[PDB]
Design a protein around this ligand. Structure first.
Ligand SMILES: [Mg+2]
Ligand SMILES: [Mg+2]
Ligand SMILES: [Mg+2]
Ligand SMILES: [Mg+2]
Ligand SMILES: [Mg+2]
Ligand SMILES: [Mg+2]
Ligand SMILES: [Mg+2]
Ligand SMILES: [Mg+2]
Ligand SMILES: [Mg+2]
Ligand SMILES: [Mg+2]
Ligand SMILES: [Mg+2]
Ligand SMILES: [Mg+2]
Ligand SMILES: [Mg+2]
Ligand SMILES: [Mg+2]
Ligand SMILES: [Mg+2]
Ligand SMILES: [Mg+2]
Ligand SMILES: [Mg+2]
Ligand SMILES: [Mg+2]
Ligand SMILES: [Mg+2]
Ligand SMILES: [Mg+2]
Ligand SMILES: [Mg+2]
Ligand SMILES: [Mg+2]
Ligand SMILES: [Mg+2]
Ligand SMILES: [Mg+2]
Ligand SMILES: [Mg+2]
Ligand SMILES: [Mg+2]
Ligand SMILES: [Mg+2]
Ligand SMILES: [Mg+2]
Ligand SMILES: [Mg+2]
Ligand SMILES: [Mg+2]
Ligand SMILES: [Mg+2]
Ligand SMILES: [Mg+2]
Ligand SMILES: [Mg+2]
Ligand SMILES: [Mg+2]
Ligand SMILES: [Mg+2]
Ligand SMILES: [Mg+2]
Ligand SMILES: [Mg+2]
Ligand SMILES: [Mg+2]
Ligand SMILES: [Mg+2]
Ligand SMILES: [Mg+2]
Ligand SMILES: [Mg+2]
Ligand SMILES: [Mg+2]
Ligand SMILES: [Mg+2]
Ligand SMILES: [Mg+2]
Ligand SMILES: [Mg+2]
Ligand SMILES: [Mg+2]
Ligand SMILES: [Mg+2]
Ligand SMILES: [Mg+2]
Ligand SMILES: [Mg+2]
Ligand SMILES: [Mg+2]
Ligand SMILES: [Mg+2]
Ligand SMILES: [Mg+2]
Ligand SMILES: [Mg+2]
Ligand SMILES: [Mg+2]
Ligand SMILES: [Mg+2]
Ligand SMILES: [Mg+2]
Ligand SMILES: [Mg+2]
Ligand SMILES: [Mg+2]
Ligand SMILES: [Mg+2]
Ligand SMILES: [Mg+2]
Ligand SMILES: [Mg+2]
Ligand SMILES: [Mg+2]
Ligand SMILES: [Mg+2]
Ligand SMILES: [Mg+2]
Ligand SMILES: [Mg+2]
Ligand SMILES: [Mg+2]
Ligand SMILES: [Mg+2]
Ligand SMILES: [Mg+2]
Ligand SMILES: [Mg+2]
Ligand SMILES: [Mg+2]
Ligand SMILES: [Mg+2]
Ligand SMILES: [Mg+2]
Ligand SMILES: [Mg+2]
Ligand SMILES: [Mg+2]
Ligand SMILES: [Mg+2]
Ligand SMILES: [Mg+2]
Ligand SMILES: [Mg+2]
Ligand SMILES: [Mg+2]
Ligand SMILES: [Zn+2]
Ligand SMILES: [Zn+2]
Lengths: 53, 69, 110, 181, 141, 123, 154
RNA sequence: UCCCCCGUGCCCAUAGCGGCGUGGAACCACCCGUUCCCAUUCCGAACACGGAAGUGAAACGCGCCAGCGCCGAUGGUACUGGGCGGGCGACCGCCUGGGAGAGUAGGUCGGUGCGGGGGA
RNA sequence: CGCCUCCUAAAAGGUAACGGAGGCGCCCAAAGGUCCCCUCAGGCGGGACGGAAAUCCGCCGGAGAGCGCAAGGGUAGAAGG
RNA sequence: CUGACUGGGGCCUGUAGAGCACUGAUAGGGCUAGGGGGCCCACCAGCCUACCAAACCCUGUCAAACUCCGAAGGGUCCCAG
């Protein structure tokens, strides 16, 4: 990690729990990350959005 | 061939100044040209045009043998 | 010096062999199509089928589907059920694909 | 396939003569055209006017075939070149479209060349293929002064089944390639 | 005097002097040679001293072959320092020479001239040496 | 490339337009149009392709032009150098050939001034 | 040529023992045979110093055979500069590659040649800063083959 | 069982490179086409489909040849486990058991398993 | 002064000195998953601008290229494109 | 009864030695792109080079961080004393 390469949380769009930690380069990828991910609460795959860590 | 990206080749007739006519295929239906194989100096015999000169010089000069003997 | 043909043949076959299933290999000539189910551990062929042996002629694809059915018929009879399809240098398409369809149609599992 | 004047000439006039000149024993032993490859070296479009679809479209007009792009294999400081930059157009002509292009080339294009006095006898591959370079693209019949932004030249590869220079020369000569010596 | 034009590594560990020479044990070029009887690190300045001795005896005549090359860096700490603090600086170059090695050969000169020259050369070396003549044994290798 | 190897400018008169060809001065322009019977005052845009080829055919066959003329001019200069007369020597060093002074001027042949230090004066 | 030299057979006699008693251990072989032999050192030394690998040496075996050989290999002792081992190559009718001396009428004392044993020469003449010749141009007395590359510099 | 071809393995150059020669009935390839499925950062080149007039030219298969490559003894030596001596040292020697590499002789222009098609 | 690579290290592992040499404190949303396809550097020859080196063609070329960064190992029957 | 040690057998290894196929070092000679220098010449190219210049070949060598090779031994498992 660094200033350009930040740490981030992935929040399930449906039930709103954060389920995943990961990183991105906010210069290369300034958009909030959106990834389909299995949500343990919803028990199904859901679009997850980047959230501030 | 791939659809959409290529230009159609159609029957076409290319016409030269020397009255030559060429039956071929092109993107354009009819095309008019200043020169062709049939009339180009290098192609036709040796049609040496204006220059028969070779080159002449120097002692084609002559004119004459007048300076005395 | 290897050809793209051989590399492709080596590549898909190597991947196939690792699973350890019996190998349904398929050869496709300009005229004909051949299939033999192979035990790579014993290096032995258990069952075979081909357009040439069955003396079929016609639509190459339709012929392919038939030799596929033929292979399966002899196959289940020998107790053979599961298999891994080896397309080798060929795309999974057309004649090769029709043969695979015939083998499946016949009751082969893959 | 279709009838093209140069193609027919190859089969009825050129093929018998070649057997006469060289005495092949097999109908495949005798020289053939394999393909013609055209290349616009370009790279004038490396940075400035970073896309010249103009050269592609005009090349598409001449051949009837849309060229594919070629990108830099490596970065080169001196050429102001970054690896992967679009710096060329190449189109591969085979079969009818090869004949048609060669036909107009020999009949009208080469004669249009400035101060043209025949091709270079020495430009043979050594392996029975030939290459020639053009500096203007207006030399072709279906390209005119009105439609052009700037002069672009090209490289032309004519590839034959002939093993040797001697066989390939006779073929190209018999087909109508005009050589200076 | 002789030394490697460039090197992959600046310093080498000292290592050993066991055994007879690996090779170079037969006359290769000239007629007469000088062969080592004892193992040593022969220095660049030693090699050059022997060569120039030979050169002077010939009055620039004849041909001299040098069949050893000093490619081993010789390291030494500066004077009056203590042990440790890294390896010393490279101060010269040596050639590892084991018994049987033909160090020098001469040719195009009389037998009397070669013998004496090779004798004077031997006196510049820190080892016992022998003078040899080319043999069928040499030419057979 | 309309004629000869060059594209003479449309929207100007033929007699003028022909001059843009290397090897045709105004004099050969007037004579070519007369000999082929085309109006000297007609804009290039407004010529029948019949007029075009007639004018074209004449001009190329009557005189040597463009590249060929340049080549023939080149051979002449080359000849002078190789023999090599004083005239040929002048072409070697790129000085005037026709007896002009070189203490001054001659800039057209010599090119831009390569200024150089002069002679200093006392104090 | 030619030279003759007494030879004897050995089996399990130690090489060190043989050499300590003045004998040179050796082997003689060809396509058909291979035998463990030894020769007297001082005698061998007399012959080899003239025969070398250029001229034929005939081994008078104890069993009465008189076999035609070429010396193919002589292993030296690097420390003492003395021969440790000899390889006698038994000649037969088939062509052999060998080294044949050169007489200048020099980077090469001799030259490598594939010649029939019946036809083995003893001389090859070469007619004579920094000009030189390349083996290709050589004399080549009948039944003889250049066994190098004609590029090779003499 | 034996010969040929087609698949597919195994040994991993004694199988390779080159130079010759040979084969189309069958098989295979090239080939004939590009309607159809599918395809080309362009190209029916490739991938693919429909074919069967032609040629074994290319490819492939099969033979020959040792120029190269590859393999490679026997003998001898280096080194050495273990046991002993010598030298001020650098280092050297003996006993017993093991034993290279290089090079020499030489060898190789493959061997073999299973299935299919054809032939005797 | 912690970590990585090679050597030292005495052919298992491990093995020291203020011994001989380098590198890390990052990075990538594609530089990750999978499917399909493709094969390098270099050398000679050929080709407008065009060069030692841009892109194009042919022949040779088993890996000497490439795999973000040190080094080593691995690797085209791909981990490379 | 498994132990140290020992017999047999399998597998793992890259040292001693050697070698030069890789990475580098390297002596003499040949053949050779860029020339140094050269009498010429520049109008435009040529020829020698008792010298410094890749690759290639021949002869001959060197290496802890080179290996096409490669021991004795060593390690480990099994059976046995
Ligand atoms: Mg996480
Ligand atoms: Mg990321
Ligand atoms: Mg998930
Ligand atoms: Mg929970
Ligand atoms: Mg965030
Ligand atoms: Mg079409
Ligand atoms: Mg049917
Ligand atoms: Mg079928
Ligand atoms: Mg298959
Ligand atoms: Mg015929
Ligand atoms: Mg040529
Ligand atoms: Mg060709
Ligand atoms: Mg035009
Ligand atoms: Mg030490
Ligand atoms: Mg000292
Ligand atoms: Mg020291
Ligand atoms: Mg220290
Ligand atoms: Mg020191
Ligand atoms: Mg030594
Ligand atoms: Mg001394
Ligand atoms: Mg003496
Ligand atoms: Mg004018
Ligand atoms: Mg004046
Ligand atoms: Mg006697
Ligand atoms: Mg001796
Ligand atoms: Mg003696
Ligand atoms: Mg020999
Ligand atoms: Mg086969
Ligand atoms: Mg098997
Ligand atoms: Mg053949
Ligand atoms: Mg034939
Ligand atoms: Mg063949
Ligand atoms: Mg047939
Ligand atoms: Mg037939
Ligand atoms: Mg269609
Ligand atoms: Mg053939
Ligand atoms: Mg051989
Ligand atoms: Mg050969
Ligand atoms: Mg060997
Ligand atoms: Mg042995
Ligand atoms: Mg021992
Ligand atoms: Mg001991
Ligand atoms: Mg022993
Ligand atoms: Mg022993
Ligand atoms: Mg033994
Ligand atoms: Mg051996
Ligand atoms: Mg040796
Ligand atoms: Mg031997
Ligand atoms: Mg044989
Ligand atoms: Mg072979
Ligand atoms: Mg086989
Ligand atoms: Mg055979
Ligand atoms: Mg087989
Ligand atoms: Mg069989
Ligand atoms: Mg059968
Ligand atoms: Mg049968
Ligand atoms: Mg270790
Ligand atoms: Mg452990
Ligand atoms: Mg990556
Ligand atoms: Mg992907
Ligand atoms: Mg080139
Ligand atoms: Mg340009
Ligand atoms: Mg690499
Ligand atoms: Mg770095
Ligand atoms: Mg017990
Ligand atoms: Mg135990
Ligand atoms: Mg034990
Ligand atoms: Mg033990
Ligand atoms: Mg060693
Ligand atoms: Mg080396
Ligand atoms: Mg060494
Ligand atoms: Mg050493
Ligand atoms: Mg080592
Ligand atoms: Mg070996
Ligand atoms: Mg150990
Ligand atoms: Mg053990
Ligand atoms: Mg064991
Ligand atoms: Mg027990
Ligand atoms: Zn949820
Ligand atoms: Zn015309």
């Amino acid at each position: 990690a660094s200033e350009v390469r930040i740490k981030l949380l992935l929040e399930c769009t449906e039930c709103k729990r954060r389920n995943y930690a990961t990183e991105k380069n906010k210069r290369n990828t300034p958009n909030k990350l959106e990834l389909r991910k299995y949500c343990p609460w919803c028990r199904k795959h859901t679009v997850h959005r980047e959230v501030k860590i | 061939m791939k659809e959409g990206i290529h230009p159609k080749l159609v029957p076409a007739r290319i016409i030269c100044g020397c009255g030559n006519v060429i039956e071929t295929y092109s993107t354009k239906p009819e095309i008019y040209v200043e020169v062709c194989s049939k009339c180009h100096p290098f192609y036709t015999g040796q049609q040496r045009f204006v220059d028969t000169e070779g080159r002449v010089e120097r002692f084609q000069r002559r004119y004459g043998d007048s300076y005395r003997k | 010096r290897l050809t793209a043909y051989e590399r492709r043949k080596f590549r898909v076959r190597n991947r196939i062999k690792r699973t350890g299933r019996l190998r349904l290999s398929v050869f496709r000539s300009l005229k004909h199509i051949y299939a033999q189910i192979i035990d790579d551990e014993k290096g032995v062929t258990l069952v075979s089928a081909s357009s040439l042996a069955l003396k079929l002629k016609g639509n190459k694809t339709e012929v392919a589907r038939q030799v596929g059915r033929a292979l399966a018929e002899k196959a289940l009879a020998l107790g053979i059920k599961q298999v891994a399809f080896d397309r080798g240098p060929y795309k999974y398409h057309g004649r090769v694909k029709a043969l695979a369809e015939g083998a499946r149609e016949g009751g082969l599992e893959f | 396939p279709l009838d093209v004047a140069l193609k027919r000439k190859y089969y009825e006039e050129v093929r018998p003569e070649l057997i006469r000149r060289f005495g092949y024993q097999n109908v495949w032993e005798v020289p053939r055209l394999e393909k013609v490859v055209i290349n616009q070296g370009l790279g004038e479009a490396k940075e400035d006017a970073r896309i010249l679809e103009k050269a592609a479209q005009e090349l598409a007009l001449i051949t009837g075939q849309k060229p594919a792009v070629t990108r830099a294999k490596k970065s080169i400081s001196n050429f102001k070149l970054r690896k992967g930059m679009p710096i060329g157009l190449r189109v591969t002509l085979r079969r009818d479209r090869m004949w048609i292009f060669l036909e107009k080339l020999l009949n009208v294009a080469l004669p249009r060349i400035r101060d043209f006095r025949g091709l270079n006898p020495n430009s043979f591959d050594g392996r029975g293929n030939y290459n020639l370079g053009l500096r203007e693209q207006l030399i072709f019949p279906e390209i005119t002064y009105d439609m052009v932004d700037a002069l672009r030249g090209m490289d032309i590869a004519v590839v034959t089944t002939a093993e040797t220079d001697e066989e390939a020369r006779a073929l190209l000569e018999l087909l109508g390639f005009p050589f200076r010596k | 005097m002789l030394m490697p034009r460039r090197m992959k590594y600046r310093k080498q560990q000292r290592g050993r002097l066991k055994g007879a020479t690996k090779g170079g044990d037969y006359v290769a070029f000239g007629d007469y040679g000088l062969v080592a009887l004892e193992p040593a690190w022969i220095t660049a300045q030693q090699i050059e001293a022997a060569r120039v001795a030979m050169v002077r005896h010939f009055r620039r005549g004849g041909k001299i072959f040098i069949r050893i090359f000093p490619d081993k860096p010789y390291t030494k700490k500066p004077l009056e320092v203590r042990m440790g603090k890294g390896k010393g600086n490279v101060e010269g170059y040596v050639a590892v020479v084991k018994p049987g090695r033909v160090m020098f050969e001469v040719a195009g000169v009389t037998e009397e001239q070669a013998m004496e020259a090779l004798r004077i050369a031997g006196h510049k070396l820190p080892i016992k040496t022998k003078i040899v003549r080319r043999d069928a044994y040499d030419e057979a290798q | 490339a309309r004629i000869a190897g060059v594209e003479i400018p449309r929207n100007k008169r033929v007699d003028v337009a022909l001059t843009y060809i290397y090897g045709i001065g105004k004099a050969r322009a007037k004579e070519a149009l007369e000999k082929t019977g085309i109006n000297p005052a007609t804009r290039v845009k407004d010529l029948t392709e019949a007029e075009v080829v007639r004018l074209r055919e004449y001009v190329e066959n009557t005189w040597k032009l463009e590249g060929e003329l340049r080549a023939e001019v080149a051979a002449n200069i080359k000849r002078l150098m190789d023999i090599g007369c004083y005239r040929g020597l002048r072409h070697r060093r790129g000085l005037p050939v026709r007896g002009q002074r070189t203490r001054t001027n001659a800039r057209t042949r010599k090119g831009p001034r390569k200024t150089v230090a002069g002679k200093k004066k006392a104090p | 040529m030619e030279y003759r030299l007494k030879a004897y057979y050995r089996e399990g006699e130690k090489p060190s023992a043989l050499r300590r008693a003045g004998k040179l251990p050796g082997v003689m072989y060809n396509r058909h045979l291979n035998r463990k032999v030894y020769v007297d050192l001082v005698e061998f030394d007399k012959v080899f110093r003239q025969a070398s690998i250029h001229h034929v040496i005939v081994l008078e075996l104890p069993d009465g055979q008189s076999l035609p050989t070429l010396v193919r290999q002589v292993n030296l002792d690097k420390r003492r500069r003395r021969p440790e081992h000899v390889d006698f190559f038994v000649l037969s009718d088939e062509p052999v590659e060998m080294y044949v001396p050169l007489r200048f009428v020099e980077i090469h004392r001799d030259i490598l040649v594939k010649v029939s044993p019946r036809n083995i020469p003893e001389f090859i003449e070469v007619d004579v800063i920094g000009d030189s010749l390349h083996a290709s141009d050589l004399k080549l007395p009948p039944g003889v083959e250049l066994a190098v590359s004609p590029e090779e510099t003499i």
